[PDB]
C-alpha cells in the first residue's frame, strides 16, 4: 500500500502521529499485526512479531525512523504470532509484560514467559499498580474467547483500540483459529472489549488490516453461534 514502509520482512503502516502497526509473516505467509506508540520521549510495544529475528527488525526500525529507546512492550496472549519474539526484546533490554495467565500458560505454549504480570480487576481493567508507567496504554482483559489469557489495548489520546487475535474484521467468515478458545465466553468478550473503548473508531486487530467498530459487532455476532 502507499505509504507503508518495508524493513527486512517486515511492514509498517502509520495510523496516526505517534502510533504505527507492525506486520510480520510466517509460512500460505500469514500476517499478524501488532503496535508502536511513541510517548513523548520513548516507545512503546504491543506484541512482537512471529520470531525474534522479526522482533529484532522492529526494533530496528524503530531506532532508524523514531530514534526513541522503547521503554516497555505489553504481549495480549501466550501464542507464537504475540509472544515469538519474547527473547529479542529481553536481549534489547525491553521490560516485557503479559497477563499473568499468559505468563503461567507460556511453558505449556511453547512461549517465553514476560518479565512482568498484569492482573485485572473483575470488571476487566489492569491493576493500575501492575502496569507502571504505562502512559496512554490502556490494557483490558475482556474475558475469554480467542484463548482464556487474552487481553487488549487502547490508546488514549487517539481513536484506536487494539483487539489482537480476539477481533476478527467485519467481513469475516470465521473466528480464525479456535483451538484454544472459550466458545461459550467469546461473544461476551467481544462485546466488554468494544464497551471497555466506547469511543475508539479504529480497531486494530491481529490478522486484517484497521477496521471501524463494525468488527467488534460482526465478531460478536459471528460468536454468538458457537455458544
Ligand atoms: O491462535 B493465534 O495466536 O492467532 C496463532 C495462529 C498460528 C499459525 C501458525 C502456522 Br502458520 C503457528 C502458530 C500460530 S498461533
Ligand atoms: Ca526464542
Ligand atoms: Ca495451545
Ligand atoms: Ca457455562
Ligand atoms: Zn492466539
Ligand atoms: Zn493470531
Redesign the pocket.
Given at each position: 500500500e502507499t505509504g507503508d514502509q518495508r524493513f527486512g520482512d517486515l511492514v509498517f503502516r502509520q495510523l496516526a502521529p505517534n502510533v504505527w502497526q507492525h506486520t510480520s509473516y510466517?509460512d500460505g505467509a500469514?500476517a499478524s499485526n501488532g503496535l508502536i506508540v511513541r510517548d513523548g520521549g520513548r516507545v512503546l510495544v504491543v506484541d512482537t512479531a512471529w520470531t525474534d529475528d522479526q522482533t529484532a527488525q522492529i526494533l530496528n526500525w524503530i531506532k532508524q525512523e523514531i530514534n526513541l529507546p522503547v521503554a516497555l512492550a505489553v504481549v495480549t496472549?501466550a501464542?507464537?504470532?504475540?509472544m515469538g519474539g519474547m527473547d529479542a526484546l529481553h536481549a534489547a533490554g525491553i521490560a516485557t509484560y503479559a497477563n499473568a495467565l499468559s505468563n503461567q500458560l507460556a511453558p505449556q505454549e511453547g512461549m517465553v514467559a514476560a518479565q512482568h504480570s498484569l492482573t485485572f480487576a473483575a470488571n476487566g481493567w489492569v491493576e493500575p499498580a501492575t502496569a507502571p508507567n504505562f502512559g496512554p496504554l490502556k490494557v483490558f482483559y475482556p474475558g475469554p474467547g480467542?484463548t482464556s489469557d487474552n487481553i487488549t489495548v487502547g490508546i488514549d489520546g487517539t481513536d484506536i483500540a487494539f483487539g489482537g487475535?480476539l477481533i476478527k474484521d467485519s467481513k469475516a467468515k470465521s473466528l480464525?483459529?479456535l483451538g484454544?478458545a472459550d466458545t461459550e465466553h467469546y461473544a461476551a468478550s467481544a462485546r466488554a472489549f468494544g464497551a471497555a473503548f466506547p469511543k475508539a473508531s479504529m480497531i486494530v486487530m491481529?490478522?486484517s488490516a484497521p477496521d471501524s467498530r463494525a468488527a467488534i459487532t460482526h465478531t460478536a455476532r459471528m460468536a454468538d453461534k458457537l455458544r
Open positions: 510466517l500469514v496472549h501464542h507464537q504470532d504475540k480467542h487475535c480464525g483459529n484454544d491481529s490478522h
